[PDB]
Amino acid sequence: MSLAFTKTRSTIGIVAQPVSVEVHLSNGLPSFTMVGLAETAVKESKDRVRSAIINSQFEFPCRKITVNLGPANLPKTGSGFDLPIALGILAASEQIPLTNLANHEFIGELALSGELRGVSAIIPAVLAAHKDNQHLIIANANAAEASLTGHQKVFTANNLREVCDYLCQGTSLQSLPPKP
Amino acid sequence: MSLAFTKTRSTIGIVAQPVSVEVHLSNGLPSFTMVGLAETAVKESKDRVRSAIINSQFEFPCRKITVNLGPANLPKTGSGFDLPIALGILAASEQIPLTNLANHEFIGELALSGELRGVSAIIPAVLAAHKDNQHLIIANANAAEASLTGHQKVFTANNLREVCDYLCQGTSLQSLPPKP
Amino acid sequence: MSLAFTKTRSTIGIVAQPVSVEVHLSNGLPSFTMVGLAETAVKESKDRVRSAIINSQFEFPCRKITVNLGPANLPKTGSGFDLPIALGILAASEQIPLTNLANHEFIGELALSGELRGVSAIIPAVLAAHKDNQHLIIANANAAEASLTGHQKVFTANNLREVCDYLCQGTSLQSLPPKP
Amino acid sequence: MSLAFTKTRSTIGIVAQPVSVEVHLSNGLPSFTMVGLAETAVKESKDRVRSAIINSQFEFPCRKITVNLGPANLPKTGSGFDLPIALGILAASEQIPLTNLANHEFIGELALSGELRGVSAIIPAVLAAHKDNQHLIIANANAAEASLTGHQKVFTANNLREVCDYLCQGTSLQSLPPKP
Amino acid sequence: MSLAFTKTRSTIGIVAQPVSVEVHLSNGLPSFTMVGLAETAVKESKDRVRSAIINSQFEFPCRKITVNLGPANLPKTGSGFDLPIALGILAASEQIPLTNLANHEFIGELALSGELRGVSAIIPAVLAAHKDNQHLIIANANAAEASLTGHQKVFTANNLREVCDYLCQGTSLQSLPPKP
Amino acid sequence: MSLAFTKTRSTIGIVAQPVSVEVHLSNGLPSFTMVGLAETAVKESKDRVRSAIINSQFEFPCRKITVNLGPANLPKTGSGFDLPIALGILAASEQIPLTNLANHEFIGELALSGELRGVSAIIPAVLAAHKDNQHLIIANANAAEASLTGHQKVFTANNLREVCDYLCQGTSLQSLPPKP
């Protein structure tokens, strides 16, 4: 069977509580289910992620998908849950080796072309990821904001193809710009 | 490809936050998903855009239509998203050459005849468009309001066919009144 | 094509905003879609219009109906939108020549037999139609209330067949009784 | 044709406004639509009346029933709309001659088996039916409250077949208020 | 005829209002419809009744059930409507002699297996049953609370099959153990 | 037959009322019904439990599931109802002997891999289970919180297979950490 456990961060107040996106593909009819108290802003990432995956020259599963963005108590608010979901889908469809996601935290928003967009309130997530020793991968638009941290384990990408190539083969991504 | 990008502006308060209308025509059955936090454009812009496209002697895709409006975490209020969405559908269906959509914004609401009615609070959009060096193509009913600025590279249109010809061809569209 | 426009009024407070009912018949399956922020009272006019057209010895289209009500950002409240919509459907289905609907403004709801019924707050609509020099056609029940103002160029009908006859061949259509 | 115009009264505040319950059996698949701002306590009248009409040895049409009860903009709120709706449905089915509902106002809900039940706030309906010159009909349970007025033309009954007889062949409901 | 009039008591304020649970069984496709102001806790009772009936080695009809618990204007907020509904459905499909429900008031919910459970605020129901001289039947768990009154004629049971046998044959379920 | 009961606790106020979980597998089409006053956080457990059962190398019933968690008046508002539901489903589908669950109480949510996660406020459940003398089984993440009571019979586990072996085979494992 195939299931993937991607990591990310959700901000509640000042602390970015860890969140564990958990995709799981079944053999039933091609539905799409999201649980874990997903707010409307994050409950509509279904079609957005579908388009961002199809447009990046990938195979979007024709299978019963079931995302589980939850510790079931915490409601999810931000819009940065598209990159974790897309990478979880790809990893659970065997298009990405699941061992690449060992210790990475992904935060990003996907357009309909696969291009990544900048989420808001990124600093708490970067601080939490640094404190947890995890690698963080964010959209280019947040590179300027996260440059202050000066943490050497943060990478920024332009689109989903960049992140997929980095995970599968490690093409160096883009690092973060120098501290101001 | 079947992916098109368009630009418009949503007015919250006094600022006109740029919006990125993204249309992606998939291969499934007829659908018109409109992700992005639209309130009254959700289920109303669909039918107006469909009828305006059909009545202007255009092919309406018999596919799964996914429309994603600008930033995900930004409620979108006005009714002027019919022209950007219609042009995005036409571009994604190749009925318009999308290589000429880069420098132009679009604002307006479409009737069922393909005619362009006048949206409210338009001058902020003109200011923003000129600041960014973009052509702003608005409905004829807002020509009076747009003429105050006298900004060059701004235009106004009677119906959707006028704009589609101004893009496919290069016919001068309407210009603006000199300064009534 | 199968596309007809009608005019009516929407009374809020002391001002009767102009509303342009727009009807389009497409080739899809049977359906009836309203647009323009129509409230429950307005949005429930579908069945009333259907039965009023059917019982008046007219032909109700089997096509997909699509009614767009005037400005897309103005909620519609009154119940007098049944007559404009019925006339729009008949005009779009070629049952009526649509040149007659040029300068007239129609108000008044429809019973299930095709007979017209009165609607509250009719004086502002009469005033607005007077300022625009538009032939107003209202339900016969509203004659006893409108005629007190002694305003001419306003005609009152009892059933949809009467209005259709007046538009097709100018068969009188009664008139507001003397001020008495 | 298939149409019927029953009558009843709706009580808001102290006054009881006239409410013309109307029916139209259109050709098509089985269906049932209750137009006219009907609240839930009226919207279950669908099943209530269907069961009453199949438990009173009557025929329930297999046609697209369309029960409109206006004035449309009046928020019907009571629950004694089952009897007028059932009578109108029967009349539109040519089971009850429609020449008998000319001067009869009906009130009182229907039990699942056919027996009429008592609705609250009946006195204002009695007062209005007195100030219209109508044969007001109520459930037997309301005889105690109708007696206080002592008015005539206030016949009452226990089940549907009692009131169907008072209309078709067998007159003399013979349940006038106990005391003048 | 597949009809059954069971009875129960609804408690609002201090008085236990009478409730007449009425069940019909049409000849259509399988369905289920609860009529009246059935609150959430009541309308979920459909599956509870179905499971309790199936597990008790009874026969669940494959018909278009239609449960109506009047009056239609009194909210049914309690949860002890499960047992009366199950008994009515059984009696409708010639599974319980209808006559045996002559003067019995049933209160208490069910589980999937059919075992009865206690309900809150039982004393007023017993007081009303004594006043109206009905053979009240309550859940076994409610026996302890229904002792302070000390009224006779009140029976208790744990399984729905016990009540079915008592109604069909008569087995003296229990005797409401006395108090000092 | 295919009916299985499981026990758990819901914290309402300061007390942990028992919540009997009941699972019924009918013969109809594949479905899933959660009867009882279950909030979104609880009725979103269908997908979680299905995925946890499938991914643990178990068999998920291809039947009309019907989950009831009584009483039908307590607003079940916890987040650790997934483990009792999964255990009940497995027992109902003759996958776990039903005699094992006769004395144990279960708590803890599930992931899409079957691993158990830590619910909030486990202490009241431990206190109530000790008072009633039931073997409480909780997720490993709650071991630290459950250690500060000193009560034995608080065995823990990491995934569904662990608890299944604990019941089926008897591989008792894990326990409260010493007594800090």
Residue numbers in the entry:
A (entry chain C), B (entry chain D), C (entry chain E), D (entry chain F), E (entry chain A), F (entry chain B): 1 to 180
Which lines from the publication concern this structure?
In Gram-positive Firmicutes, it also has a role in natural transformation, while in Gram-negative bacteria, ComM is the canonical transformation-specific helicase. Comprehensive biochemical characterization of RadA from Escherichia coli, S. pneumoniae, B. subtilis and Thermus thermophilus and ComM from V. cholerae revealed that they are functional homologs during HR. Both RadA and ComM were found to be ring-shaped hexameric DNA motors powered by ATP hydrolysis to direct three-stranded DNA branch migration in vitro. Here, we present and compare the cryoEM (cryogenic electron microscopy) structures of RadA and ComM from S. pneumoniae and Legionella pneumophila, respectively, in interaction with DNA.
Local refinements were also carried out on half of the hexamer and the Lon domain, resulting in an improvement in the quality of the map in these regions. The final atomic model of the ComM protomer reveals that the N-terminal domain comprises a Lon protease-like domain, as deduced from its sequence. Despite their low sequence identity (28%), the two Lon domains superimpose with a root mean square deviation (RMSD) of only 1 Å. In ComM, there are electrostatic interactions between S26 and R50 as well as E22 and R117. In contrast to traditional Lon proteases, the interior of the Lon domain ring is rich in basic residues, consistent with potential DNA coordination at the center of the pore. This is further supported by the observation that ComM interacts with DNA via three lysines, K43, K46, and K64, which form hydrogen bonds with the DNA backbone within the central pore. Indeed, the Lon domain of ComM contacts DNA in at least three positions: K43, K46 and K64. In contrast, we show that ComM has a larger pore radius with a diameter of 24 Å. Conversely, the p-value for ComM, which is close to 0.5, reflects a non-specific interaction and is similar to the average value for its structure. These findings suggest that the hexamerization of ComM, which is dependent of DNA and ATP, is primarily driven by global solvation-free energy rather than by interactions between specific residues within the Lon domain.
